RNA sequence: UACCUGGUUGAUCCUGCCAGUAGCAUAUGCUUGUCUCAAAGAUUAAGCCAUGCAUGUCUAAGUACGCACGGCCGGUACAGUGAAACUGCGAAUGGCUCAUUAAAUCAGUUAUGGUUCCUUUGGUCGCUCGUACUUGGAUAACUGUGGUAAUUCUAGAGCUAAUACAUGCCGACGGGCGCUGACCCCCUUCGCGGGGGGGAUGCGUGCAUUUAUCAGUGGUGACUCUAGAUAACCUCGGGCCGAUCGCACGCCGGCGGCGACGACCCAUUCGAACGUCUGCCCUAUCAACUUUCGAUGGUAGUCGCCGUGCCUACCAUGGUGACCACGGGUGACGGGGAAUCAGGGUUCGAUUCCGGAGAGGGAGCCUGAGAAACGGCUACCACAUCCAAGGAAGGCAGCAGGCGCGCAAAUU
RNA sequence: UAAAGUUGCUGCAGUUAAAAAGCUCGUAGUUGGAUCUCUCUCGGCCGAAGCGUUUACUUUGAAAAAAUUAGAGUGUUCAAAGCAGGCCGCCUGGAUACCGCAGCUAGGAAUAAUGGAAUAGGACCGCGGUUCUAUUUUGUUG
RNA sequence: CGCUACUACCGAUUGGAUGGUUUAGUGAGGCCCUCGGAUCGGCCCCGCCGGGGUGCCCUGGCGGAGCGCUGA
């Protein structure tokens, strides 16, 4: 295939979008942006499939062209804009704010946040490099580069960004005992305290994480996102508090809710 | 056209490989820039990604560095005297990387005579026409003369470079790629490398 | 051992060998400084590479190569090329219909540095993946271990 | 490419021996007693029961 | 549902095949009331194609002197709607088909510390000591003369635009920093001499580029990494350092808020391209193959976006094989998968998802971030259209549709 | 395709039904007899470091497209399907399993290969030497 | 041995037809290099000159010529 591809088959779209099979052949094909194609949520999917504010794609376009949607404090009129982890979506006309946080089953949940909490976000740091007359530079998972960071900030750390200004306010160092979320793999969406990190030089590093219920699970280092310092998260967690129920206890909970209903 | 693919080649076992696609644009090659010595002629090539390669066809000036003295100057390229790959390259006077070249020594002599206040590459007739007598002897304050005298204690050139300076032409190695950057830069040969290439050149003739 | 056997002058590019020297510091030769690097992954630099004089641009310790990716092991089978050898890797391939294995092998041409002397047909070599060095060579010998009955 | 689904199943299976007195009599008894249209309905019910029995047999061999 | 039954004998028990039995796919025959899904010119011919359609695109914001409409006022340069044309972007996606292709493709796993990357997103964009209250020449649309049998052919003439082509400042700007060092001062030393300062005048200066040298902010398992210092360079077929548009309008005589375009470089996204490891059907009535025209490796280079015999020169004689090399065949595109199946297996996978290849057969290119592109171009080979015989124009393995081939497949 | 245990790995046959080379040697291949019951340093008792010869094997963990398959929920009027739906603005899904082989990961040490001293070309303790070398010296300089 | 049919082989014929590989020679077309220079400009020079200062040159706008100098 000469040149880049511009379409996305519906059955070839990422499964966490929860797209059906009979609506069409194609999928929204996220635009290039701060988040990778497989790990993002396009604006149209969120605005139409998730929130049901629009019934068709044309209605999503009509919504976005009145400049009502803001992603991390900036008006975004692109309906296929890739909104990813920890992004803040603000709709002032109706007055709500959402944070894209993975659910326990590895899907972007509709998570409403208070307007006070919509003024900042947390970003994982991807690399630090010195350039241009010895000025340090940070690169985050959100593709934003910040010059003059705190010298203590190292790779795999987490920084709190004020969305209005774009500057760092504080940070969490990657260390055992700090709370984290898994942003990829089998344990995606799970929240727990880092227990141990084993280093394999020349290969991937494995991080062990223990839930609040005592369950343990491993991931790769690139799949770990520091959420809070110690046991306390710096953001609000979704309704499922990051713990994964087995199918048996999920069925028991569903049956109990059914019995208590009515 | 010209191709740089690996599939037209035999396998390591010696068997033939049957091509599974026709020639692709990203495997192309281009004719060589057999850079000559002459008045500057450089052509630009639009290459992959929209960037630019400078294809030097004729060159007569280079940027050469005297490493022991850290003196880099723009000099005139005179002749090609050795090529480790082919002899026809010396015969046709082609400037490629690692080719041994004769460069004019005038800027280096000027820098030496201005920095050390000692003559370099001069005959015994001792002409020393004005503005060179001044640059070599002059009149200076006690501090300046003391600084120059301090310099003179560690200003001794190897005999081979002194002979070359007497002749007016130095041996240099081209460290750049004229067919890719359009520039013939390099360094003045000295030390054991100079001895090696002098022996090789003498044995070649 | 003379190291100037090619038409061109052999020299470690990083080292500068024409530094000006005063006659007061002319005790024979300056003992030309040697460039060497420590390849990671817990591999020791051979003392030969540090104290040697060979020029090998494909040497993992004194040349311009980066060890990355896969680290494998083999047995030396042939040493008839210049600075490169042929090793043999043997393995068993499983066949599921019969629940049984079959013995297979494949040869690999790997670059051998002059820092590994007294390499015999039969010893074990730990090689590491690098960028293509030739048409068929993609590995560099990182460690040599003698055979089980050497002298 | 289209926006259609092609998942489909056969709800019955056919007996291997087409003519045998006992099977024919038993199927006719079922048809008459439950007012069925043909033998395909009997085979459909037989197939659902067979799938259920296969699933149960798979589960039994597992650990309790 | 882990299943058998008929047939050799005068009769018996075996071996053993033939036949029966069930499913699944293609075709075909007879038959057919309702309703929901739903495959469909793959097989033979990657054979040939009439005709029509399948890729175009304008916002408040690049260029409007078409009355083509419409003014409001009529000198208010330009109201607005706006065909056309210039400019920009896309046309490299999608769709089709399965001819080629046998460690190739492809799959899983890794690498780029060996490269390119339009766009989106973030950073950077007075860091450089050197007409501007705005520069120049065209050209199209349009108006007029045309030529040819003929095309989405174009020529001559007359105007006129730019975010098309070019050209080119001011300012920040005071300096700082390297070098230079006329001179001047202090100090010690009788003194000499030594030590320490201030300095006029000259050259250079930022980020990109090319080379050489020096020291050792942040990073990696590992850089010859990142940053720093120095001497220079910096392509006339030139590198960045805004001569651009819109909307609100303001304050104190100059300063300004939102945007939109553009831009070197870095990062990011989308990739792509080479590599690593393991894995493929039949065939020995293919047992040795490659190497004189690169086969395997070394040194230096050329070319390439880069690592590499990729190519060249000089060297060495290597490299693969009964663990099946090399050669041949395939009714072979590879997978995810499909049919059948107690358990193990056998067979199928042209076919809607992923990857590859091709656009009648080869080859060569332009433009572009991205084609060796064919609903782009240039040739040759095979077909074939119009012709006034001078010439011109082709490519349905896109959607319909026709011919042909066939056992075999739908509406211009 | 099953029937075909008539291709036989599971799992067939070779005295007479088709079938063991005329006989022996012999390279590759395949197979191969008993036997052997973690610590010294670093950082805050642990976290670190090796290396126990290396594995094969077994168990775990990670990474592994969706569709399809298995399978949870859900009265499409039922069903094949679909991913929907339920209650009087709320409530709730869009699970889970499986994914050879090869490649990563951490436990086990039966089985099976492989080695560890027999010219001592041995282990451990101390010794002594030989050589080169990094820094202590040391407000500072020196 | 005789009667009929089918299949297959050897095939004299020095078989053809189709295809595919090459030796040698020729070689379209593109691309690169070295030239080439039909034309179109700009500077200059004058006849021509608008005005500034003042006849007085710093810039408009022409025609003529210069293998003048250069660019495309
Ligand atoms: Mg395509
Ligand atoms: Mg790595
Ligand atoms: Mg570029
Ligand atoms: Mg008989
Ligand atoms: Mg009978
Ligand atoms: Mg039968
Ligand atoms: Mg029947
Ligand atoms: Mg009806
Ligand atoms: Mg079709
Ligand atoms: Mg066909
Ligand atoms: Mg246009
Ligand atoms: Mg665009
Ligand atoms: Mg384009
Ligand atoms: Mg930007
Ligand atoms: Mg005109
Ligand atoms: Mg090379
Ligand atoms: Mg080579
Ligand atoms: Mg050669
Ligand atoms: Mg085929
Ligand atoms: Mg197949
Ligand atoms: Mg197929
Ligand atoms: Mg076919
Ligand atoms: Mg496809
Ligand atoms: Mg193509
Ligand atoms: Mg055709
Ligand atoms: Mg083509
Ligand atoms: Mg077409
Ligand atoms: Mg096309
Ligand atoms: Mg058609
Ligand atoms: Mg017919
Ligand atoms: Mg049919
Ligand atoms: Mg069968
Ligand atoms: Mg059976
Ligand atoms: Mg039998
Ligand atoms: Mg017998
Ligand atoms: Mg016998
Ligand atoms: Mg044997
Ligand atoms: Mg035993
Ligand atoms: Mg799957
Ligand atoms: Mg199902
Ligand atoms: Mg595995
Ligand atoms: Mg020829
Ligand atoms: Mg030609």
């Amino acid at each position: 295939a000469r040149g880049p591809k511009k379409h996305l088959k519906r059955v070839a779209a990422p499964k966490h979008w929860m797209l059906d099979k009979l609506t069409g052949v194609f999928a929204p094909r996220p635009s290039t942006g701060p988040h990778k194609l497989r790990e993002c949520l396009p604006l149209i999917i969120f605005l139409r499939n998730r929130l049901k504010y629009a019934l068709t794609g044309d209605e999503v376009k009509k919504i976005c062209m009145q400049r009502f949607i803001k992603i991390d404090g900036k008006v975004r009129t692109d309906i296929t804009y890739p909104a990813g982890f920890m992004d803040v979506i603000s709709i002032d006309k109706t007055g709500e704010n959402f944070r894209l946080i993975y659910d326990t089953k590895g899907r972007f949940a509709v998570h409403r946040i208070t307007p006070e909490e919509a003024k900042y976000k947390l970003c994982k740091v991807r690399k630090i490099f010195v350039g241009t007359k010895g000025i340090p530079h940070l690169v985050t998972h959100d593709a934003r580069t910040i010059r003059y960071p705190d010298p203590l900030i190292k790779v795999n750390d987490t920084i709190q960004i004020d969305l209005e200004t774009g500057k760092i306010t504080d940070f969490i160092k990657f260390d055992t005992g700090n709370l984290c979320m898994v942003t990829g793999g089998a344990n995606l969406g799970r929240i727990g305290v880092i227990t141990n990190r084993e280093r394999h030089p020349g290969s991937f590093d494995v991080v062990h994480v223990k839930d609040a219920n005592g369950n343990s699970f491993a991931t790769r280092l690139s799949n770990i996102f520091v959420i809070g310092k110690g046991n306390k998260p710096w953001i609000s967690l979704p309704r499922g508090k990051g713990i994964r129920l087995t199918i048996a206890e999920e069925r028991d909970k569903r049956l109990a809710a059914k019995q208590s209903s009515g | 056209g010209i191709s740089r693919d690996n599939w037209h080649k035999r396998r390591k076992t010696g068997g033939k490989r049957k091509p599974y696609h026709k020639k692709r644009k990203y495997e192309l090659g281009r004719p060589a820039a057999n850079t000559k010595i002459g008045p500057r002629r450089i052509h630009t090539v639009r290459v992959r990604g929209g960037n630019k390669k400078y294809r030097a066809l004729r060159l007569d000036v280079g940027n050469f560095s005297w490493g022991s003295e850290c003196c880099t100057r723009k000099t005139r390229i005179i002749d090609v005297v050795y090529n480790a790959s082919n002899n026809e390259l010396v015969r046709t006077k082609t400037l490629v990387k690692n080719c041994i070249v004769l460069i004019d020594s005038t800027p280096y002599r000027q820098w030496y005579e201005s920095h050390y206040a000692l003559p370099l590459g001069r005959k015994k007739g001792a002409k020393l026409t004005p503005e060179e007598e001044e640059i070599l002897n002059k009149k200076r304050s006690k501090k300046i003369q003391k600084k120059y005298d301090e310099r003179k204690k560690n200003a001794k050139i190897s005999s081979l470079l002194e002979e070359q300076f007497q002749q007016g032409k130095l041996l240099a190695c081209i460290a750049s790629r004229p067919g890719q950057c359009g520039r013939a830069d390099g360094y003045v040969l000295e030390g054991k490398e100079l001895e090696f290439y002098l022996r090789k050149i003498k044995a070649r003739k | 051992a003379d190291i100037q056997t090619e038409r061109a002058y052999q020299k470690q590019p990083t080292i500068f060998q024409n530094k000006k020297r005063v006659l007061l510091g002319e005790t024979g030769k300056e003992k030309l400084p040697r460039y060497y690097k420590n390849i990671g992954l817990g591999f020791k630099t051979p003392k030969e590479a540090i104290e040697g004089t060979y020029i090998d641009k494909k040497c993992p310790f004194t040349g311009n190569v980066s060890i990355r990716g896969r680290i494998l092991s083999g047995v030396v089978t042939k040493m008839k090329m210049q600075r490169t050898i042929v090793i043999r890797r043997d393995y068993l391939h499983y066949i599921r219909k019969y629940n049984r294995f079959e013995k297979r092998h494949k040869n690999m041409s790997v670059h051998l540095s002059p820092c590994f002397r007294d390499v015999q047909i039969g010893d074990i070599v730990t090689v590491g993946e690098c960028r293509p060095l030739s048409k068929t060579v993609r590995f560099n010998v990182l460690k040599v271990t003698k055979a089980a009955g050497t002298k | 490419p289209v926006a259609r689904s092609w998942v489909c199943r056969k709800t019955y299976v056919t007996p291997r021996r087409p003519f045998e007195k006992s099977r024919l009599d038993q199927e006719l008894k079922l048809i008459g007693e439950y007012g069925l249209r043909n033998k395909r309905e009997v085979w459909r019910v037989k197939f659902t029961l067979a799938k259920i029995r296969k699933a149960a047999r798979e589960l039994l061999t597992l650990d309790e």
Side-chain angles (χ1 to χ4, degrees):
Chain A
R2 326 160 270 162
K5 279 173 125 66
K6 299 193 225 143
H7 290 73
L8 188 48
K9 283 314 171 44
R10 191 171 201 83
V11 80
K15 167 107 155 180
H16 68 88
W17 293 0
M18 277 163 305
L19 287 189
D20 58 346
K21 301 196 306 181
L22 263 45
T23 302
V25 178
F26 292 107
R29 178 91 204 178
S31 269
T32 52
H35 295 276
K36 303 225 301 287
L37 174 143
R38 294 300 287 202
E39 283 178 359
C40 81
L41 184 69
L43 196 46
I44 167 172
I45 298 289
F46 174 80
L47 223 43
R48 167 186 70 178
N49 297 124
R50 279 318 105 75
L51 288 193
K52 323 276 191 198
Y53 273 112
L55 266 57
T56 59
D58 209 75
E59 276 176 342
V60 185
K61 171 214 65 197
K62 291 204 204 238
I63 286 176
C64 287
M65 296 306 326
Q66 326 173 55
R67 321 192 104 246
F68 290 154
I69 303 315
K70 272 160 50 169
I71 306 194
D72 301 34
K74 313 192 60 177
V75 169
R76 291 273 117 87
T77 58
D78 193 274
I79 79 173
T80 55
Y81 189 82
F85 190 54
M86 297 286 303
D87 276 294
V88 169
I89 301 161
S90 262
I91 318 180
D92 302 320
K93 189 70 174 344
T94 81
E96 46 250 17
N97 314 262
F98 315 88
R99 177 162 267 134
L100 285 192
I101 291 304
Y102 286 116
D103 203 49
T104 308
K105 284 176 188 167
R107 308 172 301 223
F108 281 124
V110 168
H111 175 52
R112 309 187 177 260
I113 69 183
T114 205
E116 301 68 89
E117 202 206 345
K119 296 177 149 52
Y120 70 89
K121 75 179 312 203
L122 307 172
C123 293
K124 185 183 188 181
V125 302
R126 290 277 181 80
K127 62 175 176 183
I128 308 139
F129 64 96
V130 201
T132 315
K133 319 200 170 189
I135 292 159
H137 295 271
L138 249 188
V139 171
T140 81
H141 86 289
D142 259 310
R144 51 175 89 220
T145 93
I146 310 162
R147 58 218 281 280
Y148 303 115
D150 193 325
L152 291 191
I153 294 171
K154 297 311 172 184
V155 197
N156 300 133
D157 289 342
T158 285
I159 51 173
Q160 202 193 61
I161 285 268
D162 192 358
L163 290 179
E164 295 41 41
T165 82
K167 313 292 220 310
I168 59 187
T169 75
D170 47 351
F171 64 99
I172 304 128
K173 297 288 291 107
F174 177 89
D175 191 32
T176 87
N178 283 340
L179 196 69
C180 78
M181 185 179 285
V182 171
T183 44
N187 306 286
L188 156 71
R190 270 176 113 168
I191 295 183
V193 155
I194 295 163
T195 284
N196 153 83
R197 153 202 197 178
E198 61 197 59
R199 315 177 120 91
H200 312 271
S203 190
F204 309 99
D205 287 352
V206 184
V207 179
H208 296 259
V209 170
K210 172 173 299 316
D211 274 340
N213 275 173
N215 308 107
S216 308
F217 49 94
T219 41
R220 286 198 181 160
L221 180 57
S222 52
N223 288 338
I224 285 307
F225 202 113
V226 205
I227 269 44
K229 182 132 39 188
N231 266 47
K232 306 301 319 150
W234 282 16
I235 58 170
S236 41
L237 312 182
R239 181 177 181 170
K241 299 296 183 181
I243 89 177
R244 199 183 258 166
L245 314 171
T246 80
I247 50 184
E249 25 191 31
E250 211 211 30
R251 168 203 66 208
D252 160 72
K253 203 200 65 175
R254 200 236 316 150
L255 289 200
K258 257 190 186 171
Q259 292 287 335
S260 300
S261 294
Chain B
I2 297 155
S3 178
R4 295 180 80 260
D5 50 67
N6 304 298
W7 47 259
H8 82 305
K9 205 105 182 172
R10 285 195 179 258
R11 304 202 228 257
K12 98 169 288 183
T13 69
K16 306 203 49 51
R17 189 168 14 218
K18 264 185 266 148
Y20 83 100
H21 64 63
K22 67 206 234 203
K23 287 188 203 178
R24 292 291 149 87
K25 151 92 175 186
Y26 57 80
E27 316 164 329
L28 80 96
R30 283 182 200 101
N34 298 289
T35 319
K36 297 264 143 300
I37 290 173
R40 185 164 62 189
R41 178 172 292 169
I42 295 163
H43 294 169
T44 59
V45 186
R46 193 247 189 226
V47 286
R48 210 196 208 284
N51 316 89
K52 175 190 325 198
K53 259 177 174 121
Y54 308 78
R55 183 122 297 154
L57 300 179
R58 290 157 183 202
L59 284 178
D60 57 17
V61 151
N63 193 60
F64 290 89
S65 191
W66 197 358
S68 35
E69 318 268 330
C70 198
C71 173
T72 313
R73 291 289 178 273
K74 171 207 235 180
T75 86
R76 154 179 48 110
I77 289 159
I78 295 177
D79 188 85
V80 191
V81 299
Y82 189 72
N83 193 291
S85 306
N86 207 338
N87 238 345
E88 279 311 305
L89 294 179
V90 189
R91 208 193 69 55
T92 41
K93 310 286 163 23
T94 297
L95 305 158
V96 297
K97 204 199 157 201
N98 224 27
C99 55
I100 310 293
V101 61
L102 280 166
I103 58 168
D104 176 9
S105 63
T106 305
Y108 306 104
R109 209 261 313 282
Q110 273 178 29
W111 169 86
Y112 192 95
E113 299 212 338
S114 34
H115 181 261
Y116 281 141
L118 274 153
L120 183 50
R122 303 245 171 235
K123 298 302 150 330
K124 317 324 323 303
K127 274 69 58 183
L128 231 56
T129 165
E131 282 249 341
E132 293 62 71
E133 191 60 88
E134 271 278 46
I135 221 67
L136 258 162
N137 282 85
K138 224 180 106 180
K139 293 179 179 179
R140 325 174 154 88
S141 96
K142 317 294 306 294
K143 297 92 59 171
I144 317 297
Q145 249 308 341
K146 171 238 175 66
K147 180 185 60 131
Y148 280 85
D149 300 330
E150 171 267 314
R151 285 181 177 160
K152 292 178 175 34
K153 319 181 316 154
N154 39 324
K156 293 179 179 179
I157 290 198
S158 81
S159 50
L160 307 135
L161 271 166
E162 209 94 338
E163 161 41 283
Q164 299 196 85
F165 272 114
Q166 300 294 336
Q167 273 339 285
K169 288 145 9 178
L170 309 169
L171 279 183
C173 191
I174 291 202
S176 160
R177 288 156 92 201
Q180 310 260 296
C181 73
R183 291 152 127 160
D185 321 315
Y187 55 94
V188 168
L189 282 177
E190 56 208 325
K192 316 218 58 56
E193 202 170 351
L194 174 55
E195 172 258 326
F196 171 97
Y197 281 120
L198 277 167
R199 182 182 65 198
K200 277 280 146 41
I201 292 171
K202 170 163 73 50
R204 181 179 180 274
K205 336 291 186 176
Chain C
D2 202 20
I3 66 189
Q4 303 304 317
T5 42
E6 327 265 359
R7 313 248 297 130
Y9 185 76
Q10 304 294 293
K11 141 198 54 164
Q12 279 184 330
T14 308
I15 292 297
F16 179 55
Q17 27 177 42
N18 293 320
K19 166 168 198 3
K20 263 189 114 179
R21 270 159 39 253
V22 80
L23 190 45
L24 195 131
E26 183 178 2
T27 59
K29 213 78 206 306
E30 210 250 13
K31 198 218 281 278
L32 191 31
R34 175 81 157 176
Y35 164 77
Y36 60 90
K37 85 173 92 190
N38 154 275
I39 56 142
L41 308 174
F43 282 104
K44 274 102 218 152
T45 307
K47 148 166 64 33
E48 167 32 271
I50 301 168
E51 309 170 14
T53 176
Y54 64 90
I55 298 302
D56 186 18
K57 88 178 147 165
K58 285 128 182 266
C59 180
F61 307 98
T62 59
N64 199 19
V65 281
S66 212
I67 296 297
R68 60 195 217 234
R70 300 204 192 273
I71 281 84
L72 311 169
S73 325
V75 303
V76 172
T77 42
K78 270 178 317 167
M79 302 163 74
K80 293 179 179 179
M81 323 180 251
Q82 324 185 188
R83 277 171 175 169
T84 189
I85 60 175
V86 168
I87 71 168
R88 198 196 219 238
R89 308 201 33 234
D90 317 77
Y91 55 95
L92 297 166
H93 178 237
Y94 184 66
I95 306 293
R96 214 209 308 150
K97 170 162 172 169
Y98 304 96
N99 321 121
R100 303 199 209 260
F101 302 88
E102 41 166 333
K103 204 147 307 169
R104 290 188 174 187
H105 85 291
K106 27 205 58 186
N107 297 354
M108 206 186 314
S109 298
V110 299
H111 181 89
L112 175 87
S113 267
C115 64
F116 299 111
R117 292 169 317 320
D118 299 340
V119 169
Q120 309 309 108
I121 302 285
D123 36 21
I124 316 288
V125 284
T126 300
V127 297
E129 185 205 4
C130 63
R131 74 183 155 79
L133 300 173
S134 75
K135 183 177 159 188
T136 62
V137 169
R138 280 94 170 92
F139 283 80
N140 238 305
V141 174
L142 300 184
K143 184 169 59 177
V144 178
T145 131
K146 269 309 155 203
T150 60
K151 195 62 76 224
Chain D
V2 281
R4 300 163 203 182
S5 194
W6 303 300
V7 284
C8 57
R9 279 179 198 261
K10 253 184 78 158
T11 288
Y12 69 102
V13 301
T14 40
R16 172 193 316 181
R17 300 180 180 271
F19 317 113
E20 66 193 327
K21 268 325 221 182
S22 64
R23 201 204 83 237
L24 292 162
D25 288 9
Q26 177 225 324
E27 260 138 33
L28 177 63
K29 245 176 214 162
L30 286 168
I31 279 155
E33 137 60 13
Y34 291 104
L36 305 172
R37 188 189 32 179
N38 44 30
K39 312 247 166 155
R40 197 157 56 219
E41 282 164 342
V42 194
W43 302 339
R44 150 172 86 196
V45 182
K46 205 175 157 187
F47 193 42
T48 86
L49 176 79
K51 290 210 249 200
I52 284 165
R53 293 190 78 254
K54 221 195 69 167
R57 213 182 332 129
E58 203 296 89
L59 289 191
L60 268 283
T61 65
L62 275 189
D63 176 41
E64 301 71 304

